[PDB]
Design a protein around this ligand. Structure first.
Ligand SMILES: CO[C@H]1O[C@H](CO)[C@@H](O)[C@H](O)[C@H]1O
Lengths: 28, 564
């Protein structure tokens, strides 16, 4: 099922972006 | 012929009217970027490698997406704040000395001769060869004549119409191809049976074909391949091609020249977003039509026997690259096939116009002023035109090398050549932009060492040659087995290490010469030492572009995951 793995990729990329913005707002 | 004649009349009229009679909005900038990148070379290469390998090649274009936003978010502020017209001028300002600037300009020019112009000329040549049934060299001559006519008349608003025409033509082609095969599920349910019925090879050199690569690859559907077993491994994609695309977008003169004309930083960012969204599209619009051509015409595309391949294309290793031209020759209706060739010529013309302008602003400005500090404007324009003519003839002369390389397919040749010489420039630019410690000679020696190692690994490639399963190339496995993107990563890392080693062991550069020329000091209000703009964005538009960039990244990652 391509759609489920695409959604998983979206979720992991969203977590990555959230972490990146969190460290950006923490370390300025 | 009527459609082609009408399009030529439109081009001549537009050029004549333009001849007779820095604040660009986001959409014209994005269209200019897309038209500068996308050309006949991209279509031919993607279709050919999709016919040969599969969708993995399309993952290259999708990796050109991410870097663009970096280009729009990391290196564009430095380029605008430094007031650098070109890329070598930036390193002239930051490092100093006329040796690094001159050499980097020359290396960029060579990367142009065997990465941009030659491939586009060969792609137009194969288009005319498939459509008009001519010889390859005669097709090159015809393409040279028509491109000279186009440059004389058309020359340079136009970006938007060029992109719209290209996208419309490609969308029409994919629409008529998917129903020809039966749809997306039609292509995916019948691709693996595209094996040809001709595996004889009457020449006693190989006899019966090994029956290993005439069939489509078992992992052709998957976008991500095995790290060592599969061709185009995912380490060689995600890390291998980011380095090359850094040079392509964030460091090459073509993209920055087409990008420095934005109205402001926000407009540049929005244009980058539009270019990335348009970069989602060319996967569906190129790689899948190549599989269409493979399915409908397997014997004429997936040939492996040297005799039939020489009959079809003139090359015994290739003929996978005629996937796209043949497709528009037969699949499209009889009344059509003029609009498709018009679209292909439009993409080629946009790419060549951008390349010619960038080569002129590189050689005519950097080298000529370094040699002739003061000259007339007419002399400068004449130098630019002569440089364009010379660069075109040099690429035409280099085209026979492009004819047969990297297994007979063109886009793999582009990736291989660009994986050998770009990573030095990528490492030098990254170190200059993010490492203040680097000096002029610290970067120069690392750059020249990277060039030497790249040339040492590159000379066997066009010396021994390349071949398919029928006749594999005779070269050591140690110096050939490693993928060109793996070698790109390794050379990038060793060049970075060499540059850092030379810099930390030699006299540094004072900070007073390093204002607004480094990403860590974009907002510094102090004065510069003159070793030889004014970016701003209101919060509302900045946050709007930030959120739409996040959404665009989400879409790109979704399509990455969806195709494994
Ligand atoms: C010629 O352009 C092609 O190859 C370069 C690397 O050379 C990629 O960055 C780009 O996405 C692709 O379209």
């Amino acid at each position: 099922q391509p759609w489920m793995q695409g959604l998983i990729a979206v979720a992991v990329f969203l977590v990555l972006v959230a972490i990146a913005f969190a460290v950006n707002h923490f370390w300025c | 012929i009527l459609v082609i004649a009408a399009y030529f009349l439109l081009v001549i009229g537009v050029g004549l009217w333009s001849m007779c009679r820095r604040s660009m909005v986001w959409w014209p900038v994005g269209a200019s970027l897309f038209a500068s990148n996308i050309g006949s070379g991209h279509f031919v290469g993607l279709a050919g490698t999709g016919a040969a390998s599969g969708l993995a090649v399309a993952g290259f274009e999708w990796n050109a997406l991410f870097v663009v936003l970096l280009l729009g978010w990391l290196f564009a502020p430095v380029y605008l704040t430094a007031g650098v017209i070109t890329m070598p001028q930036y390193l002239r300002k930051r490092f100093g000395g006329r040796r690094i600037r001159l050499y980097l300009s020359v290396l960029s020019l060579f990367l142009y001769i065997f990465t941009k112009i030659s491939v586009d000329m060969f792609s137009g040549a194969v288009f005319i060869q498939q459509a008009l049934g001519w010889n390859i060299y005669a097709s090159v001559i015809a393409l040279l004549g028509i491109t000279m006519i186009y440059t004389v008349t058309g020359g340079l608003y136009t970006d938007t119409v060029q992109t719209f025409v290209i996208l419309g033509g490609a969308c029409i082609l994919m629409g008529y191809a998917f129903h020809e095969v039966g749809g997306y599920s039609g292509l995916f349910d019948k691709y693996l049976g595209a094996a040809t019925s001709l595996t004889v090879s009457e020449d006693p050199a190989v006899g019966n074909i090994s029956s290993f690569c005439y069939r489509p690859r078992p992992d052709s559907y998957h976008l991500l391949r095995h790290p060592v077993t599969g061709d185009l491994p995912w380490p060689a994609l995600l890390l291998g091609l980011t380095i090359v695309s850094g040079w392509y977008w964030c460091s090459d003169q073509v993209i920055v020249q087409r990008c420095l004309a934005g109205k402001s930083l926000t407009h540049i960012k929005a244009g980058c977003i539009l270019c990335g969204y348009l970069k989602l599209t060319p996967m569906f619009l190129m790689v899948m039509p190549g599989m269409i051509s493979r399915i409908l015409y397997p014997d004429e595309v997936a040939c492996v026997v040297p005799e039939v391949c020489r009959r079809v294309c003139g090359t015994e290793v290739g003929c996978s690259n005629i996937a796209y031209p043949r497709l528009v020759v037969k699949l499209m209706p009889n009344g059509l096939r003029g609009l498709m060739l018009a679209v292909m010529l439009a993409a080629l013309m946009s790419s060549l116009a951008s390349i010619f302008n960038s080569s002129s602003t590189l050689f005519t400005m950097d080298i000529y002023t370094r040699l002739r500090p003061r000259a007339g404007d007419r002399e400068l324009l004449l130098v630019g035109r002569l440089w364009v003519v010379f660069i075109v003839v040099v690429s035409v002369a280099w085209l026979p090398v492009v004819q047969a390389a990297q297994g007979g397919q063109l886009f793999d040749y582009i990736q291989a050549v660009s994986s050998y010489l770009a990573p030095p420039v990528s490492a030098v630019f990254v170190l200059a932009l993010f490492v203040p410690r680097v000096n002029e000679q610290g970067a120069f020696w690392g750059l020249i060492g990277g060039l030497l190692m790249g040339l040492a690994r590159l000379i066997p490639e066009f010396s021994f040659g390349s071949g398919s399963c029928v006749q594999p190339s005779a070269c050591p496995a140690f110096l050939c087995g490693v993928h060109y993107l793996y070698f790109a990563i390794v050379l990038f890392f060793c060049s970075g290490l060499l540059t850092l080693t030379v810099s930390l062991c030699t006299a540094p550069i004072p900070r007073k010469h390093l204002h607004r020329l480094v990403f860590s000091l974009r907002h510094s209000k102090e004065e510069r030492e003159d070793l030889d703009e004014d970016i701003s964005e209101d919060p509302s538009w900045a946050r709007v572009v930030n959120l739409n960039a996040l959404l665009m990244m989400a879409v790109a990652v979704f399509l990455w995951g969806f195709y494994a």
